[PDB]
RNA sequence: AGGGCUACACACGUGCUACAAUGGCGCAUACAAAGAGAAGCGACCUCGCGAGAGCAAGCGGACCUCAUAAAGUGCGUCGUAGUCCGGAUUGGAGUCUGCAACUCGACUCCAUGAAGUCGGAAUCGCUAGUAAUCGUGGAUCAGAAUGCCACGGUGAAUACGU
RNA sequence: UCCUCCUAAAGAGUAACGGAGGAGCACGAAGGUUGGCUAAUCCUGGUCGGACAUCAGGAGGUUAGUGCAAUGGCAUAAGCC
C-alpha cells in the first residue's frame, strides 16, 4: 500500500492546494484499474483465450473474467455469447500494488519508452493505455512465452474532468510526455 | 477474495542495477534482478543542422 | 539477458549475441566486449550480473534500437521533404544509388507486378 | 563525394552571381547551368533557376539544402508511369 | 553549356553471387604460371581501423615495382538455424581520380541485413590435365569489369555401345 | 382448416376471387420457485483492432427484448442471470 499511503499523505494535500477544493472528499481518487485482453484469435482456438487468461492472472494476481460477445458480428465472424476476451477489475490493495508495479517496473521496461500520451483521457478524468507485449511485466517469463499478446489498462478515477485526472496521475509522477 | 482460485500473491524483492530495491507483492515467485527502474530510466530521470556541419567540414 | 531494451540470446557466444541489438554489428560487438573486458566466446548465460551491467554501460555509448531508428527515419524524411533526387527516389520506391531499373531493381520494386 | 581536403566545388560565375545578388538584396532568380555547384549557406533565401536539360527550374534555397548540389533539385527525366 | 545514351508496369539472352557443414568465421602456415610499367610501376618508413595519405628508393627491368597466389594444410569455433548461411537494399561518415562524381564513378568504414533452403515446362557445356573448382595477369583506360583476352593450382565421372 | 391486423360505422358480431402477414411447432428447460439484474443506439479514451469483437466512462431512457406473424401487453418486469 505504498502508493495508497503516498496518496493519503502527500497527494491529497497537493491536490487540495492546486485546485482549492472546499472539502477533502472533493479530491479525485483512483477508484479501479481494469485490465482487458481483446482476444479475437479465440474464434478458432480456445487455448489462445486460456493462455491470455493465464497471462492476465500472472500479471494482475487475479483470476480473470472471460468476456463474451454481446451481439453477433459477421465482420469479425462472431456470434452472440462467444468468449472473445478476458478482463480483471483491480480494487483497493491489489489495485495500488499493481499501480506501483506498473509505474515503477513495467513502464520502464517498455521497448523504446518515450513517455505516455497525456491526451489518452476519456473526457471524464479516466486514463486508458495500451500494452503491446506482456513480457514488460516480470511476472511473465520470457522463455515460456507461447504467443505475443498485449492488453488494455484503464484507470478509472473520481475526477470530474480530464485536467483533474491528469493532475491526480501526475502527482504519482506518472510518466506523462 | 474468493478462495482457492487466484494466483499465489506474495511479497518479493526487486533489485535494480542502479541499487534501487523495492519490496513488492507479486505472482512471479522468485526475487527479481531489474535492468532498469523508474529511478534510473532515462525518460523518468530527465536525461533524454546543415549550415553548422557545412562550416565544420569546410573550414576556410 | 536484457540489454538496450531487447532480450539478448543466452545460449549464443556473446560476440554473436550482442549483434541482436539494432545498431551493433560485429565490429561494435567486438569493441563492446573488449571495452567490458569479456572474451568473445563466453556465452551470455555464463556471465555475471556485474558483467551484464558493464555490457549495458558499454552499449550506452552507442546510438541503438529506437533512437537509431528515429535517426534513420529522420534522415529519410528529410530527404523526402527536400524534394531532391534522392528524396524522390525514396518517394517512388526506386533504387536511390544510381542502379539500373530497366531490369533488376527488384529489392526496391518488390515482386513483379504483371500488366 | 568530393575529397574534404579539396573543399566544396562551386563554379566561379555562380559564386560571383550569388555574391552580387546577396549584396543588392533579393533579386529575381539567377539563371545558372551549374548543376555541379554545391549549395552554400550564403545562397539561403535566393532563388536559383537551375537548368535540367531544357528548362531552368526555380529552386528556393532553404537551410536543409546546404551542401547538396543544385542539380539534385532540377530533375532531368520526365516519367509519369507506363500504361496511363 | 546543360541534358540524354544510365529512363522502368513489363518480356528475353549472357553472366556474377548464393541458398551453406565437401561449409562460414578466426589464428598460423605451404606450393604457381603468365604478364605490365616512364605524364608509368612505385618499395622502405611514418600516419590512418580502412579506402588511402605524406616522405621517398629502385626500375625502360631474369636486377626494381605492381606482387600475401587462392583453393590447400593444422589448430579452434559455429551445430542445421533464414543461421556466425546469403549480402541485396538503405542511412551515416569518408577516400581517390578527375576542371567537375546531382543526374551518373570506383573504393573504404560504421550501421542495415532483402530474396534465396537447389529452381515448372524446357534447356546448355564438357571425352582429360578436359569438366568442375581456385586464385593470377593484360588490353581499353585519368577514373571506371561479374565482360573480353590470357595464365597457372587442384583435378574428376563416364563412353557397354549405335 | 387455424392465428394476427385493417375493412368493422368508440360493447359483441359483421361480407367480397377486399387490403396485408403468419401456423400445421419448439422447450425437462425455454416449465415451477427463490434471490438477483436492466435495454437499443451514439460519443470519447483504449494493444493487435479495422464501420462493426473485448475494456472504461459518458450521453440516452426501452428508440431494446419477448423461441417463431401481428396485435394487445410487459419494469412489481411477462425482458436478462
Ligand atoms: Mg558491416
Ligand atoms: Mg551505375
Ligand atoms: Mg556537350
Ligand atoms: Mg548503352
Ligand atoms: Mg595494366
Ligand atoms: Mg556471412
Ligand atoms: Mg524464405
Ligand atoms: Mg538453412
Ligand atoms: Mg571430341
Ligand atoms: Mg576463377
Ligand atoms: Mg583502367
Ligand atoms: Mg367492435
Ligand atoms: Mg359500434
Ligand atoms: Mg347481419
Ligand atoms: Mg426473478
Ligand atoms: Mg420466467
Ligand atoms: Zn533503477
XYZ file of C-alpha atoms (C1' of nucleotides) and ligand atoms in Angstrom:
696
model
C 0.000 0.000 0.000
C 2.978 2.254 -0.643
C 1.218 4.302 -3.307
C -2.015 4.488 -1.294
C -0.151 5.750 1.754
C 1.608 8.199 -0.579
C -1.769 9.300 -1.960
C -3.160 9.959 1.511
C -0.023 11.566 2.971
C 1.035 13.783 0.050
C -1.257 13.739 -2.976
C -4.356 14.814 -1.084
C -2.611 17.932 0.232
C -1.048 18.701 -3.144
C -4.374 18.485 -4.978
C -6.211 20.488 -2.302
C -3.695 23.284 -2.795
C -3.628 23.063 -6.587
C -7.408 23.123 -7.108
C -8.661 24.825 -3.911
C -11.213 22.178 -3.043
C -13.550 23.120 -0.214
C -13.680 19.570 1.188
C -11.253 16.668 1.287
C -13.906 14.411 -0.266
C -13.649 16.537 -3.419
C -10.100 15.340 -4.099
C -10.029 12.916 -7.059
C -9.497 9.274 -6.106
C -8.247 6.267 -8.037
C -11.284 4.012 -7.953
C -10.437 0.968 -10.074
C -7.938 -0.280 -12.652
C -9.304 -2.655 -15.301
C -7.049 -4.808 -17.468
C -8.625 -6.050 -20.692
C -7.371 -8.529 -23.277
C -9.334 -8.467 -26.504
C -8.612 -11.981 -27.729
C -10.093 -12.259 -31.203
C -7.824 -15.157 -32.146
C -10.004 -17.275 -29.848
C -12.675 -17.641 -32.559
C -10.860 -20.758 -33.765
C -8.513 -21.708 -30.897
C -9.662 -21.745 -27.256
C -6.160 -22.390 -25.902
C -5.375 -18.879 -27.117
C -8.028 -17.471 -24.780
C -6.925 -19.734 -21.926
C -3.308 -18.591 -22.345
C -4.448 -14.970 -22.394
C -6.264 -15.593 -19.121
C -3.147 -17.209 -17.644
C -1.051 -14.197 -18.676
C -3.610 -11.829 -17.148
C -3.687 -13.872 -13.938
C 0.100 -13.770 -13.686
C 0.190 -10.019 -14.337
C -2.651 -8.832 -12.126
C -2.684 -11.559 -9.485
C -6.424 -12.173 -10.020
C -8.264 -14.918 -11.874
C -9.715 -13.102 -14.898
C -13.312 -12.954 -16.042
C -13.835 -14.401 -19.513
C -15.837 -11.944 -21.582
C -18.274 -12.934 -24.315
C -19.645 -11.353 -27.471
C -22.607 -9.104 -26.702
C -24.067 -9.410 -30.213
C -23.357 -11.375 -33.361
C -20.989 -9.658 -35.783
C -20.413 -11.024 -39.273
C -17.458 -8.692 -39.851
C -15.445 -10.489 -37.182
C -17.261 -13.827 -37.669
C -18.543 -13.797 -34.076
C -21.942 -14.951 -32.831
C -23.635 -13.641 -29.682
C -22.281 -15.095 -26.449
C -18.932 -16.222 -27.823
C -15.948 -15.796 -25.432
C -13.575 -13.331 -27.095
C -11.570 -11.788 -24.279
C -10.777 -11.548 -20.604
C -10.680 -8.772 -18.021
C -9.774 -8.191 -14.384
C -11.065 -5.433 -12.136
C -8.452 -4.378 -9.579
C -9.602 -2.512 -6.474
C -8.090 -1.449 -3.187
C -4.849 -3.049 -2.050
C -4.394 -5.097 -5.218
C -5.075 -2.024 -7.327
C -2.448 0.089 -5.559
C 0.109 -2.716 -5.740
C -0.481 -3.096 -9.467
C -0.316 0.667 -9.922
C 3.079 0.660 -8.228
C 4.399 -2.312 -10.188
C 3.171 -0.809 -13.453
C 4.650 2.649 -12.824
C 7.989 1.603 -11.333
C 8.781 -1.661 -13.149
C 6.598 -2.371 -16.173
C 6.546 1.045 -17.845
C 10.371 1.309 -17.538
C 10.527 -1.997 -19.434
C 8.509 -0.763 -22.405
C 10.574 -1.015 -25.554
C 11.655 2.474 -26.637
C 9.572 4.122 -23.925
C 9.428 7.865 -24.642
C 6.512 8.790 -22.374
C 2.796 8.048 -22.122
C 0.342 10.155 -24.090
C -1.374 12.756 -21.923
C -4.310 13.031 -24.342
C -5.469 9.486 -23.549
C -8.146 10.686 -21.139
C -11.706 9.714 -21.987
C -13.112 13.186 -21.197
C -14.047 12.456 -17.566
C -10.650 12.023 -15.979
C -10.244 8.321 -16.760
C -6.997 7.177 -18.336
C -6.598 4.250 -20.718
C -3.329 2.964 -22.135
C -2.281 0.067 -24.334
C 0.403 -2.559 -23.849
C 1.881 -4.240 -26.895
C 3.797 -7.081 -25.222
C 3.188 -8.873 -21.942
C 6.906 -9.507 -21.326
C 7.267 -5.989 -19.889
C 5.788 -7.457 -16.712
C 8.429 -9.565 -14.904
C 5.703 -11.999 -13.848
C 5.644 -13.220 -17.466
C 8.637 -15.475 -18.084
C 10.265 -14.661 -21.405
C 11.335 -18.175 -22.440
C 7.943 -19.666 -21.555
C 6.079 -17.292 -23.888
C 3.910 -19.013 -26.494
C 2.350 -16.064 -28.353
C 2.884 -12.302 -28.307
C -0.094 -10.628 -26.627
C -0.904 -7.191 -25.289
C -3.733 -5.750 -23.198
C -5.620 -2.591 -22.307
C -5.269 -0.808 -18.974
C -7.894 1.675 -17.804
C -7.545 3.740 -14.644
C -10.993 4.897 -13.558
C -10.893 7.870 -11.213
C -13.400 10.064 -9.413
C -12.281 13.134 -11.377
C -14.919 15.439 -12.820
C -12.638 16.470 -15.696
C -9.577 15.419 -17.670
C -7.396 18.132 -16.111
C -8.111 16.889 -12.587
C -7.451 13.328 -13.729
C -4.118 14.274 -15.258
C -3.132 16.229 -12.147
C -4.054 13.250 -9.958
C -1.928 10.918 -12.076
C 0.955 13.410 -12.337
C 1.009 13.633 -8.539
C 2.161 10.000 -8.564
C 4.830 11.091 -11.080
C 3.013 9.250 -13.833
C 5.251 9.140 -16.934
C 3.336 11.686 -18.984
C 5.132 13.040 -22.030
C -11.358 -12.561 -2.433
C -12.645 -15.967 -3.493
C -10.588 -18.812 -2.059
C -8.561 -21.398 -3.957
C -8.854 -19.903 -7.473
C -6.411 -16.992 -7.544
C -2.668 -16.971 -8.324
C -0.177 -17.037 -5.484
C 0.406 -13.432 -4.487
C 3.273 -12.952 -2.046
C 5.999 -10.395 -1.457
C 9.323 -10.421 -3.329
C 12.285 -8.055 -3.744
C 13.024 -6.153 -6.960
C 16.693 -5.173 -7.185
C 17.712 -2.780 -9.955
C 21.201 -2.185 -11.279
C 21.218 1.420 -10.017
C 20.933 -0.006 -6.494
C 17.205 0.626 -6.064
C 15.329 -2.026 -4.071
C 11.540 -2.257 -3.901
C 9.570 -4.763 -1.858
C 6.535 -5.650 -3.943
C 3.943 -8.392 -3.707
C 3.931 -10.423 -6.898
C 2.950 -13.673 -8.589
C 6.448 -14.178 -10.025
C 7.502 -16.369 -7.102
C 11.248 -15.663 -7.059
C 13.289 -12.492 -6.455
C 13.920 -10.047 -9.294
C 17.009 -8.507 -10.919
C 15.787 -5.475 -12.852
C 17.893 -3.927 -15.583
C 16.033 -0.619 -15.186
C 13.548 1.060 -12.876
C 11.606 4.294 -12.506
C 14.527 5.876 -10.604
C 17.085 5.305 -13.401
C 15.290 5.032 -16.750
C 16.427 7.961 -18.947
C 12.922 9.283 -19.657
C 12.000 9.215 -15.965
C 15.224 10.871 -14.805
C 15.339 13.614 -17.427
C 18.410 12.517 -19.385
C 16.599 12.080 -22.714
C 21.729 21.498 -38.812
C 23.270 21.734 -42.270
C 24.991 25.131 -42.125
C 26.849 24.091 -38.964
C 28.182 20.834 -40.404
C 28.998 22.558 -43.693
C 31.138 25.064 -41.809
C 32.752 22.402 -39.639
C 33.848 20.196 -42.549
C 34.822 23.037 -44.904
C 36.756 25.407 -42.632
C 38.410 28.227 -44.561
C 19.877 -11.021 -20.993
C 18.056 -7.705 -21.200
C 20.283 -5.091 -22.852
C 19.196 -1.918 -24.655
C 15.535 -2.829 -24.192
C 15.591 -6.186 -26.002
C 16.396 -9.738 -24.969
C 19.875 -10.943 -25.957
C 20.146 -14.665 -26.864
C 21.514 -16.513 -23.861
C 22.989 -19.667 -25.432
C 24.997 -17.861 -28.145
C 28.532 -16.580 -27.816
C 28.489 -13.014 -26.520
C 30.022 -11.590 -29.706
C 27.197 -13.139 -31.740
C 24.507 -12.444 -29.146
C 25.176 -8.695 -28.976
C 24.522 -8.296 -32.713
C 20.876 -8.942 -31.880
C 20.856 -5.234 -30.944
C 19.746 -2.957 -33.779
C 22.863 -0.861 -34.355
C 25.559 -3.250 -33.112
C 27.357 -5.226 -35.795
C 30.359 -7.487 -35.495
C 32.899 -4.666 -35.160
C 30.832 -2.950 -32.461
C 30.177 -6.279 -30.746
C 33.915 -6.942 -30.546
C 34.623 -3.400 -29.365
C 31.934 -3.538 -26.663
C 33.235 -6.879 -25.412
C 36.823 -5.622 -25.380
C 35.801 -2.456 -23.514
C 33.828 -4.518 -20.988
C 36.746 -6.930 -20.547
C 34.829 -10.041 -21.629
C 36.055 -12.710 -24.042
C 34.073 -13.086 -27.253
C 33.248 -16.801 -26.957
C 31.712 -16.531 -23.480
C 28.005 -17.296 -23.591
C 25.586 -14.776 -22.129
C 24.375 -17.294 -19.547
C 27.900 -17.744 -18.230
C 28.096 -14.024 -17.470
C 27.522 -12.406 -14.077
C 25.158 -9.544 -13.279
C 28.086 -7.172 -12.882
C 29.327 -8.287 -16.298
C 25.922 -7.749 -17.919
C 25.787 -4.304 -16.317
C 29.209 -3.446 -17.753
C 27.895 -4.609 -21.131
C 24.869 -2.341 -20.734
C 27.185 0.554 -19.901
C 29.290 -0.158 -22.984
C 26.192 -0.313 -25.201
C 25.101 3.019 -23.688
C 27.833 4.863 -25.609
C 26.217 3.950 -28.948
C 23.010 5.054 -30.633
C 20.983 1.845 -30.951
C 17.458 0.447 -31.221
C 14.678 3.025 -31.106
C 16.984 6.042 -31.084
C 18.848 4.772 -34.149
C 15.554 4.003 -35.885
C 14.371 7.541 -35.204
C 17.616 8.920 -36.636
C 17.272 6.836 -39.805
C 13.631 7.829 -40.301
C 14.554 11.479 -39.740
C 17.254 11.336 -42.415
C 14.967 9.607 -44.919
C 12.083 12.016 -44.273
C 14.468 14.969 -44.533
C 15.467 13.720 -47.976
C 11.836 13.125 -48.945
C 10.734 16.613 -47.798
C 13.690 18.275 -49.510
C 12.325 17.259 -52.899
C 15.822 16.314 -54.039
C 16.548 13.458 -56.432
C 17.387 11.017 -53.628
C 14.203 12.015 -51.832
C 12.127 11.473 -54.965
C 13.675 8.030 -55.409
C 12.735 7.230 -51.813
C 9.231 8.513 -52.557
C 8.799 6.288 -55.625
C 10.249 3.129 -54.090
C 13.051 3.020 -56.655
C 16.807 2.494 -56.292
C 18.477 5.564 -54.825
C 22.152 4.873 -55.634
C 22.058 5.146 -59.430
C 21.414 1.451 -60.123
C 19.782 0.263 -63.322
C 16.000 -0.050 -63.395
C 15.451 -1.346 -66.953
C 15.941 -4.769 -65.369
C 16.528 -5.902 -61.771
C 15.831 -3.275 -59.082
C 13.593 -5.945 -57.528
C 14.669 -5.425 -53.902
C 13.255 -1.903 -54.174
C 10.390 -2.500 -56.586
C 9.238 -5.700 -54.881
C 7.906 -8.701 -56.791
C 6.973 -8.151 -60.423
C 3.542 -6.629 -60.999
C 2.260 -8.049 -64.312
C 0.499 -5.880 -66.886
C 31.835 12.600 -52.905
C 34.474 15.293 -53.344
C 37.527 14.960 -51.131
C 37.260 17.051 -47.972
C 40.805 18.406 -48.358
C 39.758 19.943 -51.683
C 36.835 21.816 -50.141
C 33.417 22.110 -51.774
C 33.253 22.761 -55.504
C 31.319 25.715 -56.903
C 31.500 27.441 -60.267
C 33.078 30.903 -60.078
C 30.443 32.589 -62.238
C 27.785 31.231 -59.892
C 29.640 32.322 -56.748
C 30.002 35.821 -58.186
C 26.328 35.944 -59.179
C 25.305 34.824 -55.682
C 27.527 37.439 -54.023
C 26.185 40.229 -56.234
C 22.584 39.195 -55.643
C 23.096 38.936 -51.878
C 24.640 42.414 -51.777
C 21.985 44.063 -53.955
C 19.273 42.403 -51.892
C 16.876 39.729 -53.166
C 16.774 39.808 -56.947
C 14.792 37.742 -59.384
C 16.000 34.142 -59.820
C 19.577 33.782 -61.062
C 19.721 31.576 -64.142
C 22.561 29.066 -63.927
C 23.601 25.893 -65.712
C 25.965 24.828 -62.913
C 24.155 21.778 -61.575
C 27.518 20.607 -60.198
C 27.966 23.567 -57.812
C 27.486 22.953 -54.102
C 24.828 24.959 -52.281
C 26.457 27.329 -49.803
C 24.884 28.887 -46.693
C 25.083 32.326 -48.308
C 22.617 31.233 -51.015
C 19.807 30.695 -48.489
C 16.841 32.878 -49.422
C 17.896 33.331 -53.037
C 16.027 31.678 -55.891
C 18.300 29.906 -58.381
C 16.748 28.775 -61.667
C 18.713 25.604 -62.437
C 18.842 24.016 -65.880
C 17.542 20.465 -66.099
C 18.391 19.990 -69.778
C 15.619 22.018 -71.411
C 14.267 24.474 -68.814
C 15.544 26.254 -65.733
C 13.834 25.073 -62.544
C 13.385 27.778 -59.865
C 14.949 26.429 -56.655
C 14.048 28.299 -53.472
C 17.114 27.590 -51.363
C 16.499 26.688 -47.709
C 18.867 25.724 -44.909
C 18.298 21.991 -45.415
C 19.785 22.222 -48.934
C 23.247 23.450 -47.904
C 25.952 21.038 -49.010
C 23.806 19.496 -51.761
C 24.293 20.156 -55.458
C 21.976 22.425 -57.407
C 21.234 19.632 -59.882
C 19.672 17.494 -57.159
C 16.690 19.877 -57.285
C 16.238 20.063 -61.083
C 15.232 16.598 -62.330
C 16.347 15.774 -65.859
C 13.993 12.934 -66.852
C 10.224 13.127 -67.296
C 8.480 9.996 -66.018
C 4.790 9.683 -65.182
C 4.196 5.936 -65.478
C 3.719 3.210 -68.069
C 0.245 2.378 -69.402
C -1.581 5.528 -68.262
C 26.857 24.933 -71.972
C 23.395 21.821 -69.763
C 20.637 17.176 -70.530
C 20.346 12.100 -72.810
C 22.621 7.286 -74.439
C 22.235 5.061 -67.027
C 14.573 6.168 -68.101
C 11.223 1.405 -65.975
C 4.028 -1.641 -65.389
C 6.976 -5.362 -68.259
C 9.285 -9.868 -71.805
C 14.003 -12.400 -73.370
C 19.527 -13.534 -73.804
C 24.501 -13.834 -71.440
C 26.744 -13.703 -66.728
C 28.110 -12.882 -61.225
C 26.834 -14.147 -56.234
C 24.203 -17.619 -53.391
C 20.947 -20.827 -50.939
C 25.675 -23.399 -46.754
C 28.776 -28.046 -42.643
C 32.805 -31.421 -49.061
C 30.734 -25.020 -45.321
C 31.312 -19.923 -42.615
C 34.445 -17.414 -39.352
C 39.444 -16.679 -36.505
C 44.696 -17.791 -35.919
C 49.006 -19.930 -38.162
C 51.446 -21.787 -42.367
C 52.926 -24.269 -47.690
C 53.190 -24.767 -53.321
C 52.427 -21.173 -59.333
C 52.340 -19.580 -64.274
C 51.871 -15.735 -67.316
C 52.223 -10.548 -67.801
C 52.728 -4.919 -67.382
C 55.423 -0.481 -66.152
C 58.406 6.383 -67.546
C 52.620 12.167 -67.615
C 54.427 4.872 -65.736
C 55.190 0.771 -61.868
C 56.175 2.701 -57.317
C 59.383 -0.211 -52.368
C 61.069 1.055 -47.249
C 59.440 4.187 -43.460
C 55.533 7.387 -40.874
C 50.210 8.445 -40.255
C 45.299 6.284 -40.664
C 40.514 0.751 -38.387
C 40.323 1.335 -43.762
C 39.980 3.228 -48.870
C 44.208 5.960 -48.666
C 47.914 9.860 -47.282
C 52.993 12.098 -46.558
C 58.015 11.276 -47.440
C 60.792 8.885 -50.709
C 64.437 4.306 -53.025
C 64.692 1.252 -57.118
C 63.190 0.083 -62.282
C 62.712 1.353 -69.587
C 63.640 -4.287 -65.908
C 65.805 -12.660 -65.468
C 68.030 -6.981 -61.212
C 63.209 -2.650 -59.206
C 57.862 -2.383 -58.714
C 52.919 -3.997 -59.377
C 53.044 -8.716 -56.057
C 50.232 -12.126 -49.182
C 48.525 -16.611 -55.140
C 43.921 -18.974 -53.731
C 41.965 -23.249 -53.237
C 45.211 -26.263 -49.624
C 47.190 -27.821 -44.607
C 46.960 -27.557 -38.905
C 44.523 -25.595 -34.704
C 39.770 -23.596 -32.710
C 34.707 -22.373 -33.211
C 29.833 -22.433 -35.130
C 25.938 -27.412 -34.902
C 21.393 -27.197 -39.347
C 19.222 -22.138 -37.801
C 16.905 -17.963 -42.854
C 21.709 -19.387 -39.019
C 28.284 -16.907 -37.152
C 24.454 -19.161 -44.404
C 23.469 -15.084 -48.003
C 24.969 -9.951 -48.816
C 20.828 -7.299 -51.982
C 18.837 -2.650 -50.226
C 19.097 1.750 -47.378
C 21.116 5.663 -43.562
C 25.530 7.995 -41.741
C 30.753 9.157 -42.333
C 34.914 9.088 -45.901
C 38.953 8.319 -49.815
C 40.815 8.782 -54.772
C 40.860 10.041 -59.982
C 39.326 13.952 -62.467
C 38.177 21.423 -64.387
C 33.762 18.609 -62.462
C 31.419 12.285 -59.418
C 23.280 15.676 -58.817
C 21.566 13.203 -62.890
C 25.812 9.238 -63.334
C 32.252 6.687 -60.752
C 35.224 3.105 -58.135
C 36.671 2.056 -53.376
C 36.594 2.355 -47.601
C 34.437 2.447 -42.533
C 30.107 2.121 -39.146
C 25.191 0.611 -39.192
C 21.249 -2.239 -42.035
C 20.735 -7.424 -43.144
C 16.091 -8.447 -48.682
C 15.228 -12.551 -51.815
C 17.170 -17.101 -51.534
C 16.627 -23.709 -48.039
C 18.948 -26.031 -55.029
C 14.882 -23.894 -59.016
C 7.795 -25.745 -63.795
C 7.638 -26.825 -68.784
C 12.037 -26.607 -71.131
C 17.334 -26.255 -71.934
C 23.312 -25.752 -72.285
C 28.545 -27.220 -71.934
C 32.076 -30.917 -71.497
C 35.680 -37.237 -73.608
C 41.482 -35.440 -69.835
C 45.233 -32.221 -67.426
C 39.051 -31.804 -70.228
C 34.737 -30.768 -66.978
C 34.437 -28.695 -62.190
C 36.656 -25.510 -58.847
C 40.623 -21.869 -57.204
C 43.231 -17.795 -57.485
C 46.785 -14.509 -61.101
C 47.699 -11.104 -65.223
C 46.628 -7.870 -69.611
C 44.229 -4.600 -73.356
C 40.795 -0.415 -73.382
C 41.849 3.121 -69.615
C 42.519 9.939 -65.797
C 38.955 7.118 -63.126
C 35.576 3.307 -64.152
C 34.790 -5.249 -65.248
C 30.752 -10.011 -62.560
C 32.707 -8.605 -69.780
C 36.787 -9.991 -73.001
C 41.694 -11.909 -73.824
C 45.426 -14.731 -71.283
C 47.862 -17.693 -67.015
C 48.871 -21.257 -63.795
C 46.892 -24.732 -58.904
C 43.794 -28.717 -57.596
C 41.588 -32.118 -60.532
C 37.173 -35.988 -61.560
C 32.865 -39.075 -63.736
C 31.721 -41.861 -67.899
C 31.690 -43.877 -73.097
C 28.598 -51.127 -72.810
C 27.539 -49.329 -77.455
C 24.818 -47.425 -82.477
C -58.558 -25.771 -41.537
C -56.183 -22.454 -37.800
C -53.688 -17.334 -35.876
C -52.895 -11.568 -36.192
C -54.226 -6.604 -38.107
C -57.457 -3.436 -41.167
C -62.229 -3.115 -43.767
C -65.794 -3.179 -38.841
C -69.546 2.544 -38.581
C -65.508 4.078 -29.945
C -69.667 -3.054 -26.451
C -70.051 -8.249 -29.257
C -70.601 -9.815 -34.180
C -70.320 -8.426 -39.339
C -69.336 -9.713 -46.404
C -66.493 -9.760 -51.145
C -61.798 -14.101 -56.197
C -61.376 -6.760 -50.330
C -56.089 -4.865 -48.192
C -51.563 -7.158 -45.519
C -48.914 -11.141 -42.861
C -48.383 -15.952 -40.232
C -49.381 -21.590 -38.258
C -49.547 -27.385 -39.028
C -44.245 -26.194 -33.972
C -40.492 -25.523 -30.182
C -38.921 -26.331 -24.971
C -37.229 -31.353 -18.832
C -35.892 -26.062 -19.592
C -37.137 -22.044 -22.957
C -41.504 -25.304 -17.041
C -42.083 -24.109 -11.067
C -39.965 -21.130 -7.276
C -36.403 -18.054 -4.561
C -32.601 -14.440 -4.905
C -30.585 -11.055 -8.069
C -30.371 -7.857 -12.577
C -31.878 -3.992 -16.674
C -32.100 -2.484 -22.889
C -31.170 -0.124 -28.142
C -28.011 3.348 -30.289
C -24.410 7.046 -30.348
C -19.767 9.852 -28.385
C -14.891 9.919 -26.008
C -10.490 7.151 -24.427
C -8.012 2.234 -25.121
C -2.527 -3.409 -27.848
C -3.141 -6.005 -32.254
C -8.381 -3.991 -33.545
C -10.374 -2.143 -38.646
C -17.548 0.827 -39.863
C -18.502 -3.310 -36.541
C -15.350 -8.029 -31.290
C -13.459 -7.138 -25.928
C -12.422 -2.765 -21.933
C -13.594 2.179 -19.325
C -16.536 6.317 -18.973
C -20.485 9.497 -20.740
C -24.965 10.586 -23.322
C -29.739 8.117 -23.981
C -34.071 6.098 -21.460
C -36.663 0.803 -23.721
C -35.980 4.072 -29.915
C -34.261 -2.796 -26.734
C -36.040 -7.650 -25.598
C -40.099 -11.474 -25.962
C -38.190 -19.421 -29.279
C -41.452 -18.055 -34.370
C -46.550 -13.456 -37.658
C -49.238 -9.452 -35.948
C -51.842 -7.046 -32.297
C -52.551 -6.184 -27.251
C -49.142 -6.432 -23.044
C -44.711 -6.398 -20.063
C -40.029 -2.512 -15.066
C -43.658 -5.278 -9.255
C -40.946 -6.697 -15.404
C -44.068 -11.181 -18.884
C -37.208 -8.920 -20.619
C -31.627 -10.960 -18.524
C -28.759 -14.340 -14.810
Mg 29.419 -4.321 -41.853
Mg 25.800 2.616 -62.349
Mg 28.394 18.588 -74.854
Mg 24.136 1.643 -73.864
Mg 47.722 -2.596 -66.775
Mg 28.176 -14.299 -43.627
Mg 12.258 -17.682 -47.497
Mg 19.267 -23.275 -43.943
Mg 35.892 -34.637 -79.451
Mg 38.428 -18.369 -61.373
Mg 41.838 1.263 -66.048
Mg -66.170 -3.690 -32.404
Mg -70.265 0.305 -32.961
Mg -76.396 -9.392 -40.253
Mg -36.733 -13.122 -10.800
Mg -39.871 -16.985 -16.202
Zn 16.967 1.527 -11.312
